[PDB]
Amino acid sequence: KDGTLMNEFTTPILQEVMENSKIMQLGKYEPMEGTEKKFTFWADKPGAYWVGEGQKIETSKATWVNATMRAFKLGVILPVTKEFLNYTYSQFFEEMKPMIAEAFYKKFDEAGILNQGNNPFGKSIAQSIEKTNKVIKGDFTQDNIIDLEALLEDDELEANAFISKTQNRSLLRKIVDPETKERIYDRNSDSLDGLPVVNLKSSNLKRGELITGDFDKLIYGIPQLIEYKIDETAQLSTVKNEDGTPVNLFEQDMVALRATMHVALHIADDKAFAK
Amino acid sequence: KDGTLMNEFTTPILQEVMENSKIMQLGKYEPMEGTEKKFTFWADKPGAYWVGEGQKIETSKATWVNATMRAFKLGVILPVTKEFLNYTYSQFFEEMKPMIAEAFYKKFDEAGILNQGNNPFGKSIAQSIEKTNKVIKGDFTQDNIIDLEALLEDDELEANAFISKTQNRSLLRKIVDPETKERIYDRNSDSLDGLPVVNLKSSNLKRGELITGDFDKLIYGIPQLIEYKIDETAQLSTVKNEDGTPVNLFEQDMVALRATMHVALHIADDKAFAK
Amino acid sequence: KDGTLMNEFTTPILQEVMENSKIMQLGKYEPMEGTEKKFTFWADKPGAYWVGEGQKIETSKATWVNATMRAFKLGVILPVTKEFLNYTYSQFFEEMKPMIAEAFYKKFDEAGILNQGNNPFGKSIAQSIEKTNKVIKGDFTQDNIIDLEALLEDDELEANAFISKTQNRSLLRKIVDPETKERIYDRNSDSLDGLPVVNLKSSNLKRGELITGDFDKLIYGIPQLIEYKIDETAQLSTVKNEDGTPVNLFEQDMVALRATMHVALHIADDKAFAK
Amino acid sequence: KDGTLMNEFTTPILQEVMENSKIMQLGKYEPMEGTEKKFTFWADKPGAYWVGEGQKIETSKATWVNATMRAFKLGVILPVTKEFLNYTYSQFFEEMKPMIAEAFYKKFDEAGILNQGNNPFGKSIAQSIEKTNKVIKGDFTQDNIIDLEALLEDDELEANAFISKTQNRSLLRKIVDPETKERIYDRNSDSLDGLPVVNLKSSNLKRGELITGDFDKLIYGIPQLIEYKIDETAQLSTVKNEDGTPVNLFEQDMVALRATMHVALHIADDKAFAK
Amino acid sequence: KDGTLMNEFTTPILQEVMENSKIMQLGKYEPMEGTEKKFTFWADKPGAYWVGEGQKIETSKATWVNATMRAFKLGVILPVTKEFLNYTYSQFFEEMKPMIAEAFYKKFDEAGILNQGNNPFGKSIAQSIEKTNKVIKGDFTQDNIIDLEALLEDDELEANAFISKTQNRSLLRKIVDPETKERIYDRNSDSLDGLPVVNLKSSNLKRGELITGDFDKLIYGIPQLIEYKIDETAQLSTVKNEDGTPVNLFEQDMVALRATMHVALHIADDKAFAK
Amino acid sequence: KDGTLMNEFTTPILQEVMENSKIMQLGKYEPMEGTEKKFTFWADKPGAYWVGEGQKIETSKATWVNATMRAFKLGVILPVTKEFLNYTYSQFFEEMKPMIAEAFYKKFDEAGILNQGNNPFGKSIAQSIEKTNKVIKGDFTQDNIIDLEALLEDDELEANAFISKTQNRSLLRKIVDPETKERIYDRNSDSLDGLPVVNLKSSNLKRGELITGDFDKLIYGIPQLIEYKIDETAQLSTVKNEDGTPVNLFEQDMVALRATMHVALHIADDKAFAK
Amino acid sequence: KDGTLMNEFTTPILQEVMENSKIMQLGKYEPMEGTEKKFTFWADKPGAYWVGEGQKIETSKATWVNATMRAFKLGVILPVTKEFLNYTYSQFFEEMKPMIAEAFYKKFDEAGILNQGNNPFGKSIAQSIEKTNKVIKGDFTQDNIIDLEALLEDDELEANAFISKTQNRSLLRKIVDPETKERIYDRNSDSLDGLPVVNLKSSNLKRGELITGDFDKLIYGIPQLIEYKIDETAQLSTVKNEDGTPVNLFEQDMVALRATMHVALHIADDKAFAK
């Protein structure tokens, strides 16, 4: 069990959607360190004569919580000896240094886009649904999607683009208005009211389109580094038993990433509710 | 509390609120205390040739009380001490003068278009609801929006621009007529039915566009500051707080912007009512 | 009486009603001395190898209408004495030449609809409704508006222009036809109706919309006149004995305009009535 | 009694009546005193290796009628004295020859296109409605208008041109269709039907479309010279007493016209039903 | 009595009906009256370590059919005596060959389009509708016309051209269509559902949408004059012979046409039915 | 009964349409039986200054099917004696190789896209559509057609064209989009949204189109092999009766062309709702 | 002659009428439609070194009343014929306009000072009767005249000149008493209390002297309308008595002016009372 030589390559199933995950979130400006904060609150009070009204404005909301990339894998442990012996599995791990790094890049944006993904904690849509009642309950319609865009507009803002899941994109494109097109019906993605939609692969989102405005994407950069020591799930091949093993044999490259997502005031959400 | 070495940042909202205050209201400039407005009506003569019938009416309108801009409080006082010590906070104090100037029009629009803190006797919606009930009850529709414009135009007038809210912006986009697909909100130009309409973004207005013809903007400018003594004083952790608290040293920045608005006694409104 | 300063004079409202009055109801500015005449001829015969019988017609038309003039009188009584002392009241009567012109144009255009002073041959709409039925009680419809235009087109000649009030203009824009291409509304063009529509603000019409074939308008009259009262509506100033008679006046400015309205053969009529 | 100086007829209805009276309604006009039209019916019979029998016969129909425009009575009698004295009335009588020429077309169309105007040697829609019916009377609708074209195809198998009536255009425009085309005419389109035809003035027919395809209106019509003796109607009063009609001195212009209409059993007529 | 007289017969609208039969069929001319075959094709599907099993064989259909063109009877009896004395009636019988050819095409088309026309064995419209429900029963609709083509597509056959009638053209135009464009009878291309449709004169049944795929055109030729012996349709006393023998009279003018048509079960003709 | 030689060949306008069915689906050809496998996402870490997660996906995919062109005997029994004696039926069996190839393309597509056979079985497009439940309930409408194309583009890559069944193509031709453009129809090439829709002759597919772009199509080659010794009996008789097929010359040739198809869950299809 | 005049002469004692014009002066001259507001005293107190406490006040004047000068009665009618015929009397009427200008100033000053026949509310004697009486009169005395100025000084007001009638001037200057004080007379003008004062020609009582402090002068000019209309209001006797109707003949000129005197808080006035 676990240890066979065979040619394997991953293509356009998850890696294609991974590269555009944070770009769909619209990461306006990438900061060096997690210290980006908004200060303006805007204060004024109108009187008439012989009166002095006071005004105060001071705010700071910085986002800094690094999320690591994938370490040495249990499946790659059986393939590590195949990497040393054959050229096929070595090129597979070298392609993984970009493919699985993109998967770590995908899950980092998914932490903000979905509440179930916990890494950044208190960022984008994950913080939006809990703090503000922006999510519309029920079936996503052409009028309901514009009503979802109203929730993003309610906090003195405007929605840029709506992030769509693999199953949520079908339900959004199915709905069409009484007279207006709404569902595009040509080649382009179906718009909620006017703004274009971008696809983002998610595990939590199934029905309804969530829209994000201004939430920054800033990172140290998801890389790859070859190492000998990594503690995870135990793996054994022949004449060996592993219980507290980490440093003994090299399985896969311990990739390093330090990513952060800037928190927004209000971002739109949509979900199907049944009782 | 400390309050030292901080970077002040402004979000893209103050620039939009300041420009739309008088532009949506169509406030004509007048260099006088209060306001003066005129209205005239002439009479016609009979069919038979002998003598011509005279008597012609002349009516005048005036507005009172110009709302003054609010001075800086304890929040800006903590930053002004940092402005004297640090180079970065010194430019922030001058930027605070410009931000409050934008907020001065924001309070003027709240007093002008809405009845949130009425400084003038005719406050668009307050002038409508008290004198002539032209407001349409119920949900906003494309047929109902033109009918709302019909309510203002019936009393010898014409609808120029409908003041849009944050929730009303996307509510107009959702609205569509039985035959006509026109709504105008997602596009660069937004109109109620045909004639151009600008968004006001007010705390008092909840849902529904409110049309208005002519108004006034007088003697308005920007904040004048040098050295000011506070009267009431907001509660703060930094520096001493007292009942008769004022500062001789640089802490508070004074403001000077007085403006008054006149009503034509014919303006439309829209609001949702529960069945 | 009070008195008070005139300050300023309005022009904005009267300017729109003055220009559109003569062009309304398909107006023709054709020069006529005293009265204009129109004639029509008809013949009918069929037969062979026998005596022939023929017929001939000669029609006569008359249009005799007098000038519309208005003095300063009881209406501008507080401004008549104020003309000698204040600069605003003196310039008011000179500017009233264009304001009373709007009133002189107001009665001439209203005579086509109905009006109190019927200078013309009855009324261009009332005599047309008595000759041919076109008006329907209830509510004006978009399909019915095309039928109303066809109602004038059926008798004698095809209709070109449809006259409408300010309240009717907003009501016609609210109305939409069964086909998308058929309905024009407020969104497309200045005119709501399909055919050429002219705005005429009058108390006699008040939401009706009636069409006309072809009617002529001939106007000639200078606005320069000054005399010591003739009509006398109400007493002025109150300081001397005896009040009522038109004898002895301090200041009065009269403006005359002699205009004759020529009757059309066939026109349309439409009015709304509550059930 | 007493008529001088003033002359010239405007002729608003006579100008358009001459164009589409017989020219639009009928296909071709081939000049003859008694024109004859022919039609052949082909025979066909199929069988298995036997003799083929089938009688084919050609049926011909002749049309001969002379409808001349007569010299005018009563009206021209007062005008003849004015023609001899004044140059204006003499030129008016020569222009009346061209006006009566249009009236001769009006009398020809009344008994040629319309049902029973002068009843000039039968034919017209009157012959079609009595012998073969083909009218299908009812309410004027979009389905009923197509049924009029279908009635011509059911009896003779020939497509018919649009109606030449202005009073029927009012009933035609009021009709609404499920399709976007609607078919209304007058507002933008020349004709509601498939083919294009101009509306003509009707004296006998009140309401309903007069659609006819293949027809013949052969004519030899021209204005004739005025003679000394004529008797038709009322005699004119002057210095010498006269009661019996003979003219003697006064002259009225006649016309020599021979117009005939040919039938083809393909004409549409609509009539309103009320019980 | 039937008196012989010199008269030229008109070609009328019947001359265009000749080309309709072959154009609606859209089939190649076969060298002789025989048989046309079509393959059934297709074999059993995929399988490893298994038997192949049998496949379908080609099936031939009957293409040869008996037909006859009728000769002129007692209808051309008065014309035969006029042919001997005058050159006009003699040239009329030679020109009647083209008229008889139109009748010869009319009999062939009547079998393919209708059940009332009896000539060909196994009617194209009648037998196909009886064997399988392809023809629409009830009200004529634009959506129902596509449904008739869909019934033909169920048997793996695409409709090339729709068989149009003069009565059916007005019925198809009156039917409401979901599309904003709308074809309506004929404009330039004339389409029933999508592809181009040809008009055909049909006295039998009529007033219903018909569609056709591929029907055979066959060799026959035109008229062959002999002027001897006849079956005799009308008996008469002096104009025609009582006994069917014709003796030596040249009223016969024999015609030769033995054509045929064979088509697959795809063509269907809709018919109106009363509830 | 009766196995007589006819010496007649039947082909074209049936075999040509079936050949373009399976190849138009667009898939990469593979040398041996076995599909290309792709790994599905590697797991990621969430925390900083910790061990990190380690998991990688293993790729798995397979496609194995051996297709064959069937040897005919059920219909080739009479044709076997005709092939051995006459050159026409012998050349017909060689031309039947192109007919069997059409069946080989038909069986490859019908098992996948329509699930008529179980050749693909596991990797069948219709079976995958049932497993995914992406099918739209109801009639094939313009709104449903755009939703069907979007259903594939949401889950995976956007499909090129929706696979038609000719009968479904005609029903979809009746439906047209909201914008001024007809969907598919019969202009030049039928298209669902982008690329040209491939019509496939199917027994299972009748109404509703399935959209698949990334579906594999691979074959061993073309079907051509020798004929020797009888197998699988359906019908065999001429002079002596037989129960089981053995001995003598073969009726039609069994031909080898092993084809297999792999799927990636893209097809959706549409089913009509019945109550 | 009664009405007829040959030689016209200028009016005697012209300097006395001009002296009354200059007498109506105490508190400047300002031209307006009504009365202009004059600000209060506003005093300030020294108090101490550090604390700065004072007072500021503003007073307002009510805007009312304007001047008028009317046409002369009876005597003007005699002068009307003389002015029209002779150039010398016409120049005398223009010189009479300057004499009536002196009378216009005389009327406004006299009615304000005595009898209260002015339109102006609160002036000299009318101001004393409404607010507070300063001096009581019975017998003319030197001590009583000094007490009148002391009564005005008690309400904080300094008098510059005491205007009085010609009958009261001699009584105030010279009085039989024990000791005489303050008279002047020989220097420039006779004094009542101890200041130089001008006497005005007015219809006033001989017993009782009046004193003025501050009263505003206002004017709009003199002699505006020269040509007179119909005379009816004035009582005429010369040449022809006018009561009802009168032709266009100028008798006397109409003069236009506007006067309003500012109401003083303290003004001295004395009125005679019986014992």
Numbering used by the authors:
A (entry chain C), B (entry chain B), C (entry chain G), D (entry chain F), E (entry chain E), F (entry chain D), ...: 35 to 309
What does the paper say about this structure?
80α is a typical example of a staphylococcal transducing phage, capable of transferring non-specific chromosomal or plasmid DNA at low frequency. The capsids are assembled from a major capsid protein (CP) as empty precursor procapsids into which the DNA is packaged through the portal by the phage terminase. Many SaPIs, such as SaPI1, redirect the 80α capsid assembly pathway to form capsids that are smaller than the normal phage capsids and that are thus incapable of packaging full-length phage genomes. Here, we report the structures of a mature 80α capsid made from an uncleavable version of CP at 5.2 Å resolution and of a wildtype SaPI1 mature capsid at 8.4 Å resolution.
Reasoning that empty particles would be more amenable to 3D reconstruction, since the lack of internal DNA would reduce the background noise, we chose a sample in which the majority of the capsids had ejected their DNA upon prolonged exposure at 22 °C. The reconstruction reached a final resolution of 5.2 Å by the FSC0.143 criterion. Compared to the procapsid, the mature capsid is larger and more angular and has a thinner shell. No density could be assigned for the N-terminal 30 residues of CP, including the N-terminal 14 residues that are normally cleaved from WT capsids. There are considerable differences between the CP subunit in the mature capsid compared to the procapsid, especially in the N-arm, E-loop, P-loop and part of the spine helix (α3). In the mature capsid (which has no SP), the β-strand folds underneath the E-loop that extends from the adjacent subunits, while α1 is rotated by 81° towards the outside of the capsid relative to its orientation in the procapsid. This is accompanied by a straightening of the spine helix (α3) and major changes in the preceding α2 helix and the P-loop (green in Figure 6D), presenting a concerted rotation of the subunit that leads to a disruption of the α-helical palisade seen in the procapsid. During maturation, the CP subunits are rotated from a perpendicular orientation in which the A domains protrude on the surface of the capsid, to a lateral orientation in which both A- and P-domains lie tangentially in the plane of the shell. This rotation is accompanied by a reorganization of the asymmetric, skewed hexamers to almost perfectly six-fold symmetric hexamers. We hypothesize that this rotation is triggered by the release of the N-arm from SP, thereby coupling the capsid expansion to scaffolding removal.
